[PDB]
Amino acid sequence: PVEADISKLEPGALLRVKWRGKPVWLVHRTPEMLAALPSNDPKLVDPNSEVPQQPDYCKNPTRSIKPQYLVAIGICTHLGCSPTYRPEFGPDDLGADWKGGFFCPCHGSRFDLAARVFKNVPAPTNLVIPKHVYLNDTTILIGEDR
Amino acid sequence: PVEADISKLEPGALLRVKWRGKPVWLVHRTPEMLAALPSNDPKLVDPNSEVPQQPDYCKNPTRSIKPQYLVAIGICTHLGCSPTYRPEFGPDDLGADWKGGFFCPCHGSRFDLAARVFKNVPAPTNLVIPKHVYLNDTTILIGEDR
Ligand SMILES: [Cl-]
Ligand SMILES: [Cl-]
Ligand SMILES: [Cl-]
Ligand SMILES: [Cl-]
Ligand SMILES: [Zn+2]
Ligand SMILES: [Zn+2]
């Protein structure tokens, strides 16, 4: 397991830590990012996280332990590329209704800020969320829990 | 880093976990083992751990964070063999004054239960103690500290 220190992760920033050779992202989400998430539901493949791509304590609307932070494995569920981080709302290339999220440059898969995949893109499932636990308010242990 | 679960490690038992290809031992020491450690001092090369073979939080009489557990890299400082574990007091082959420890089968180096090397053996230094931290009472993370 690896410890991620988020004490300096500002609103909207993304921290990358390597675990089992995979990039694990930790994103500090703002209330605005959180407010927009449920509006994505109708356009998402698996809005309720029914597919077991996360620990049960992350099977919820924000797919996380705390709403302020998203912890997920930054590997596209299509062919394994690393998606780009696109937190800004409504960029021209992604559409005016874009509420922030991730965009994979290899085949265009889109995921929102709970790392949930949108309908009709190559990736068929939500990004994987690793087992993890907070050791304290600014430190997350990745790779294990309990 | 590697996680060591010592929740089932009984008094006097030794747990081995692999870290960076090296064997890391975690020994549950009894009050009797601990009581005998200072008696080895006069016979040890580096009783005070002056040679930097451990993190500062392990530069002490028991070369550990807590007295109940010894955490050390199980590789002899002479030529790299893995020493045998000999916790029993006074076996005939090691002498009646033996207070438990480790014995390397390749050239006879002896180390006590704080993994400190005895004088006049091939190994010249105390066994290396890796960086580590307790995540909780029965879980030690090896390879990282705070
Ligand atoms: Cl891909
Ligand atoms: Cl894709
Ligand atoms: Cl040796
Ligand atoms: Cl030896
Ligand atoms: Zn992709
Ligand atoms: Zn040896």
Author numbering:
A (entry chain B), B (entry chain A): 49 to 194
Q: What does the paper behind this entry write?
A:
Rieske protein PetA, one of the three subunits of the bacterial cytochrome bc1 complex, functions as an electron transfer pathway in the photosynthesis of photosynthetic bacteria as well as in the respiration of aerobic bacteria. PetA has a hydrophilic globular domain containing one Rieske-type [2Fe-2S] cluster and a single transmembrane α-helix. The globular domain is exposed on the periplasmic side of the plasma membrane. TtPetA consists of two domains, an iron-sulfur cluster-binding domain and a large domain.
The structure of the Zn-containing form of a Rieske protein, in which ZnCl2 binds in the cluster-binding site, was determined. Diffraction data of the colorless TtPetA were collected at 1.7 Å resolution. Two monomers were observed in an asymmetric unit. An MX2-type compound appeared to bind in the cluster-binding site instead of the [2Fe-2S] type iron-sulfur cluster, judging from the electron density. On the other hand, no such densities were observed in the map of data collected at 1.29 Å, where the f” value of zinc was only 0.5e−. These observations provided confirmation that the element in the cluster-binding sites was actually zinc. The zinc ion has a tetra-coordination manner with two chloride ions in addition to two cysteine residues in the cluster-binding site of Zn-TtPetA. The zinc ion of ZnCl2 interacts with Sγ of Cys124 and Cys152 with distances of 2.4 Å and 2.3 Å, respectively. Probably due to the vacancy at this position, the side chain of His155 takes a different conformation mainly by a rotation around the Cβ−Cγ bond. Accordingly, the side chain of His155 has no interactions with ZnCl2. The Zn-containing structure indicates that the conformation of the cluster binding site is already constructed and stabilized before insertion of [2Fe-2S].
